[PDB]
């Protein structure tokens with residue numbers, strides 16, 4: 001509360017570390033369904049069903065232009081990519097399995113870097 005704070009955490013490397021995690025995500029061989037925004041003109045139902053589309057290129061653009069105020073907002077956008085994937089794809093599908101793999105890959109890098 002006012003004048004009552006936990007010891008200050010060094011957050012100066014957070015931007016660089018999220019950038020590194022994102023690069024690792026982008027170069028994973030199962031990243032291909034998440035690299036670019038889903039084409040809303042060529043994929044029927046996607047625009048109506050998925051209220052908040054998200055992809056790795058949009059996260060990269062947001063990160064590089066100072067649009068993430070903190071760690072949690074970056075993590076929420078990464079998780080949104082995989083939550084969207086789960087909403088639109090059967091678990092028993094290549095993209096469905098890609099999403100599960102990429103979420104596990106992210107969460108391990110997230111805990112190891114910041115916990």
Ligand SMILES: CNC(=O)c1scc2c1OCCO2
Nearest residue numbers: 033034038043085088089095
């Ligand atoms: C995360 N990606 C997806 O949910 C979907 S839905 C239809 C697609 C596609 O990604 C690749 C191309 O076509």
